[PDB]
Amino acid sequence: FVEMVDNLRGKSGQGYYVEMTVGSPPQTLNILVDTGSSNFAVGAAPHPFLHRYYQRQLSSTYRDLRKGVYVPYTQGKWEGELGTDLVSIPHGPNVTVRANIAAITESDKFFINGSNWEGILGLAYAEIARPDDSLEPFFDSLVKQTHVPNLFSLQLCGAGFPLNQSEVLASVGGSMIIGGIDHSLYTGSLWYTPIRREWYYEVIIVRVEINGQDLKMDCKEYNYDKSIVDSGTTNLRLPKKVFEAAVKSIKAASSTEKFPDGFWLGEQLVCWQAGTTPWNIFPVISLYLMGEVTNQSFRITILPQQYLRPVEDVATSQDDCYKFAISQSSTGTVMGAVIMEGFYVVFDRARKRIGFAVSACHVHDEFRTAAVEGPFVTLDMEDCGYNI
């Protein structure tokens, strides 16, 4: 398992990527890790934003399905050619497997400059694959073709201040452990919440509190229409009613200071003389998630450092500058990277639950700690889940 520690690199802004090799002989590539999609896909053709790409011509083993696919993401989109080839992770477990790959030909707004990741890995379930479930998402392949246990665990570590793409290469952000939990990673005790439906890593959120204040919205409200855990997404996204709720609540705590109401949307960043940033104004939000026991639940708490995100200088002077990491959503809540940076998150597919624990690499506020705590009592939790 040590073999796999620290494999990951990246930031919330541009995603965390892992190194994989595809085809025979193997071609090295860096792939985005996404739990928001179940589709494995890569660049097979030259692009401005791409250092390297998949050339099937060289793979001896590249196999072709004579099919075409199109993939939709709230932000990017791409369409490509389905094929299968041998695939491996150097810094993963010591195995190689043949899995469906899509060679991307046309893309919109998928690739990111200096992201340094030329591919995407969707670790979500089949139902959401494209074109249809039939196509087997990669991890399933791995499990099927090997003795890898059916779980993976993700620790995502996030920088103090903006990191350059060149800097990111030097920089390391995370560890992804496959078919495993590595205890060194985390502290305290994992707390697990069920996976409501095996498509996105959907979850039910029962209570929300900011600085101990309960929004006291209807619990369905939080999960409308769903709450899913996504490393795909940079920012924590909340349904409109919920989002507006926090924002009012957050603003109050922070009222003392002037932020362009533009900031709250998160279009534009706010700058503070380096090291003077007043966190204290900022609230800590507790999300309470379903227990694995009757009428039980637990909560995880977010420091602002979590949802307020560092971005680099707008001027050739240094004032720590930050952006607002919380985004309105009309597709239900998404617990994105910023949320997942705090904690060692385990996707226990086998036991169909996801477990959260405090990340070893957790950012510091002398006075407050991100933590995961249990157990709690919540009543009629199910009523919280959403049904049309």
């Binding site: 919330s12 802004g13 541009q14 995603g15 965390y16 985005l32 890790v33 996404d34 739990t35 928001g36 993401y73 709230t74 932000q75 990017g76 990111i112 995407i120 890995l121 996504d230 490393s231 795909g232 997404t233 940079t234 920012n235 985004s327 990277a337």
Partner: peptide
């Protein structure tokens, strides 16, 4: 950002 990234939106996957």
């Amino acid at each position: 950002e990234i939106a996957x």
